[PDB]
Design a binder for these strands. Structure first.
Ligand SMILES: [Mg+2]
Ligand SMILES: [Mg+2]
Ligand SMILES: [Mg+2]
Ligand SMILES: [Mg+2]
Ligand SMILES: [Mg+2]
Ligand SMILES: [Mg+2]
Ligand SMILES: [Mg+2]
Ligand SMILES: [Mg+2]
Ligand SMILES: [Mg+2]
Ligand SMILES: [Mg+2]
Ligand SMILES: [Mg+2]
Ligand SMILES: [Mg+2]
Ligand SMILES: [Mg+2]
Ligand SMILES: [Mg+2]
Ligand SMILES: [Mg+2]
Ligand SMILES: [Mg+2]
Ligand SMILES: [Mg+2]
Ligand SMILES: [Mg+2]
Ligand SMILES: [Mg+2]
Ligand SMILES: [Mg+2]
Ligand SMILES: [Mg+2]
Ligand SMILES: [Mg+2]
Ligand SMILES: [Mg+2]
Ligand SMILES: [Mg+2]
Ligand SMILES: [Mg+2]
Ligand SMILES: [Mg+2]
Ligand SMILES: [Mg+2]
Ligand SMILES: [Mg+2]
Ligand SMILES: [Mg+2]
Ligand SMILES: [Mg+2]
Ligand SMILES: [Mg+2]
Ligand SMILES: [Mg+2]
Ligand SMILES: [Mg+2]
Ligand SMILES: [Mg+2]
Ligand SMILES: [Mg+2]
Ligand SMILES: [Mg+2]
Ligand SMILES: [Mg+2]
Ligand SMILES: [Mg+2]
Ligand SMILES: [Mg+2]
Ligand SMILES: [Mg+2]
Ligand SMILES: [Mg+2]
Ligand SMILES: [Mg+2]
Ligand SMILES: [Mg+2]
Ligand SMILES: [Mg+2]
Ligand SMILES: [Mg+2]
Ligand SMILES: [Mg+2]
Ligand SMILES: [Mg+2]
Ligand SMILES: [Mg+2]
Ligand SMILES: [Mg+2]
Ligand SMILES: [Mg+2]
Ligand SMILES: [Mg+2]
Ligand SMILES: [Mg+2]
Ligand SMILES: [Mg+2]
Ligand SMILES: [Mg+2]
Ligand SMILES: [Mg+2]
Ligand SMILES: [Mg+2]
Ligand SMILES: [Mg+2]
Ligand SMILES: [Mg+2]
Ligand SMILES: [Mg+2]
Ligand SMILES: [Mg+2]
Ligand SMILES: [Mg+2]
Ligand SMILES: [Mg+2]
Ligand SMILES: [Mg+2]
Lengths: 88, 61, 131
RNA sequence: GGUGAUGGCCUACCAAGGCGACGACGGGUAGCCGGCCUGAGAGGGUGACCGGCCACACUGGGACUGAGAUACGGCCCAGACUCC
RNA sequence: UAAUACGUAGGGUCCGAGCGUUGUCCGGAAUUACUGGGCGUAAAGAGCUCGUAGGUGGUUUGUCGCGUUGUUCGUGAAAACUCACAGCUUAACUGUGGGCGUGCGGGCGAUACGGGCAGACUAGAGUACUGCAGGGGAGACUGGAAUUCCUGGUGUAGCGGUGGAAUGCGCAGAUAUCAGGAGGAACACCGGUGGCGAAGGCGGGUCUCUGGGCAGUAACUGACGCUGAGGAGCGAAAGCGUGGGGAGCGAACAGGAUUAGAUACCCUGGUAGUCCACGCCGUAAACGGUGGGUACUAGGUGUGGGUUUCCUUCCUUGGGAUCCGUGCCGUAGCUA
């Protein structure tokens, strides 16, 4: 999981300002970084179906948040997609 | 059954267990006897009845 | 998921009547307020009220019971619900207990009782059959 | 180009699409409807007669006549049936 | 053998210029349950999840009113049904114009709820700050007792077995028993009507990576919610492929035995499998025989988890409150 120092760092450079945390953009940033680290680990550990369940749950959360953002405001949604490299 | 299931599937009514296949919906059929013999009813009632095997205009034995 | 506030409110009312309560607390809403208008003016709920809570305004319902402990409302069943919604024409207004009951109808003026709608010639959606 | 009248009705060239799981196309069934029987009702069945439409005329096709042809007893050709 | 049920008689019943049989169709059939069904066992919740489409939405602030009803004239053929009248001497029948004719059209005037459109807020949901318990999951490392086996001593006639006995292994030295060595599977007590996991199911430890759930601050987003046809992932054991491993246990298979009969129950053994690695297969009485989620509804008796606060020794299942999960009994109700 992500610990204090880099979680604070990610909040800082990905949030609207240095105080808000519960922004959808902060949510997506945390989720994406965690999923990248975890996929790196799962490429080593293969049959951990117990944690790939959390994989799929986090992916569903990502997609749901992205749907919410694209429904609300498309400009910020697409800017975030481009600046984070996600396919959709 | 929820309303959406009802719309999705439609309600199917019973398919009639049609009896008396020979007349094919007719009140009468004419036939020719082929044999005359006797048979024994089931266990509860025992007797010696008279039954005839007939050829029908609808070609059913 | 609170996917039917009207149904939940009516269920709370009938359940409180069964459990022999005195006050029922619910989140406050415009539809709740006007329905309370209807029922109180009909005489089924002794009196309502709207207060302020920690987050959102709520409401408490004060019922009555018959002099011999008698229940005030006997049965409560919703008619027009999410998914299955029911309307009525000026002539086919629903009859409950042969007029002994009250059906809440949404008409252009607002929500009025079955007799009010029948006399006015107006119609709409019947909300709940209260008896 | 064609039609009493717009239109792939027909022709040529352009583009690759259109219809499809809120059921395409496939298979069996069967003229549709005002109505008839039943049921308190919703509903189920059903299309006798009369009547409003449709399609058919020994089976398959086509065309002439005109304001009006699916042309039943109008025409031509092909098959079957019966007859001279 | 002594029929109100067969046939005959009488007598009686229904009906009637028609009376029965048969056959088609509705009904009772709420026996396809919209009105108006059920899912524990009677027939049924899939094995459990994520989640596309569809279906559905936690609040108020705002307009257009396309969902909606609101009325006015404006269509709805005749014929049939319902009301009244009218005549064929009443009789079916029609002489008779009204009345009926449940759907569809635009124009005039509404906005309460029910969509989209619209900007704002948070009681759902979600993250954010710190703590928490845990057989959660995968890899690797490691200890112990024991079975079995090999080797080697001491050591004597049996060891082992069931209701009893022989197959069995022993005089080539069995059993036992002691030293050493090998090696595989599995971790008693802790350990319970306890933890976790969505579900199968999961516990000797150590480390490595990591999932999930809960408590207070409630900082921030703000209708993102719910569940899901198809699809796809997970999924006990048994079975299959490949290559390792293979103590114990043990289908099938041999013998001993009981039995009239035993292709079994029991005994001797004993190959698949049982374990490793990767693929497979996807079924269980996959049960809580009860799908998931939210709201409401008297209590009593316990566990574990975390919080606070006070008798305050401030030691303390001393006392209070809180929220999560977890056993049993019980009112009202429901239920066959
Ligand atoms: Mg953790
Ligand atoms: Mg509201
Ligand atoms: Mg209903
Ligand atoms: Mg032109
Ligand atoms: Mg054209
Ligand atoms: Mg052309
Ligand atoms: Mg036809
Ligand atoms: Mg009709
Ligand atoms: Mg009926
Ligand atoms: Mg009906
Ligand atoms: Mg018909
Ligand atoms: Mg006619
Ligand atoms: Mg006709
Ligand atoms: Mg016409
Ligand atoms: Mg023809
Ligand atoms: Mg012709
Ligand atoms: Mg003719
Ligand atoms: Mg002729
Ligand atoms: Mg006799
Ligand atoms: Mg008799
Ligand atoms: Mg008689
Ligand atoms: Mg019937
Ligand atoms: Mg039913
Ligand atoms: Mg059963
Ligand atoms: Mg089931
Ligand atoms: Mg299955
Ligand atoms: Mg209008
Ligand atoms: Mg009008
Ligand atoms: Mg009209
Ligand atoms: Mg008329
Ligand atoms: Mg009638
Ligand atoms: Mg008269
Ligand atoms: Mg008339
Ligand atoms: Mg009708
Ligand atoms: Mg919507
Ligand atoms: Mg604000
Ligand atoms: Mg929240
Ligand atoms: Mg812990
Ligand atoms: Mg592994
Ligand atoms: Mg030795
Ligand atoms: Mg020994
Ligand atoms: Mg704030
Ligand atoms: Mg769903
Ligand atoms: Mg969905
Ligand atoms: Mg499905
Ligand atoms: Mg599907
Ligand atoms: Mg898979
Ligand atoms: Mg797969
Ligand atoms: Mg097994
Ligand atoms: Mg296996
Ligand atoms: Mg085999
Ligand atoms: Mg295999
Ligand atoms: Mg092998
Ligand atoms: Mg071995
Ligand atoms: Mg054996
Ligand atoms: Mg044997
Ligand atoms: Mg064995
Ligand atoms: Mg199965
Ligand atoms: Mg199980
Ligand atoms: Mg389930
Ligand atoms: Mg629920
Ligand atoms: Mg109880
Ligand atoms: Mg009671």
């Amino acid at each position: 999981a992500l610990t204090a120092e880099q979680k604070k760092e990610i909040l800082g450079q990905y949030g609207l300002h240095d105080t808000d945390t519960g922004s959808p953009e902060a949510q997506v940033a945390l989720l994406t970084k965690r999923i990248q680290d975890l996929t790196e680990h799962l490429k080593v550990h293969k049959h951990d179906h117990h944690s790939r369940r959390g994989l799929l749950l986090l992916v569903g959360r990502r997609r749901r948040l992205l749907k919410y953002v694209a429904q609300v405001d498309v400009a910020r949604y697409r800017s975030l997609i481009e600046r984070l490299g996600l396919r959709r | 059954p929820t309303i959406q299931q009802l719309v999705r599937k439609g309600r199917r009514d019973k398919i009639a267990k049609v009896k008396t296949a020979a007349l094919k919906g007719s009140p009468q059929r004419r036939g020719v006897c082929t044999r005359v013999y006797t048979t024994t009813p089931k266990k509860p009632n025992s007797a010696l009845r008279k039954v005839a095997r007939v050829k029908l205009t609808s070609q059913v034995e | 998921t609170m996917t039917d506030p009207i149904a939940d409110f009516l269920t709370r009312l009938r359940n409180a009547n069964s459990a022999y309560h005195d006050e029922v607390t619910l989140p406050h809403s415009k539809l709740k307020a006007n329905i309370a208008e209807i029922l109180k003016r009909e005489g089924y709920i002794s009196d309502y009220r709207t207060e302020d809570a920690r987050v959102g305004k709520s409401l408490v319902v004060q019922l009555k019971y018959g002099p011999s402990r008698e229940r005030s409302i006997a049965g409560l069943r919703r008619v027009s619900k999410p998914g299955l919604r029911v309307y009525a024409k000026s002539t086919n207004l629903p009859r409950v207990l042969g007029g002994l009951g009250v059906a809440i109808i949404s008409t252009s003026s607002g929500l009025l009782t079955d007799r009010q709608a029948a006399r006015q010639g107006v119609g709409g959606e019947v909300l709940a059959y209260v008896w």
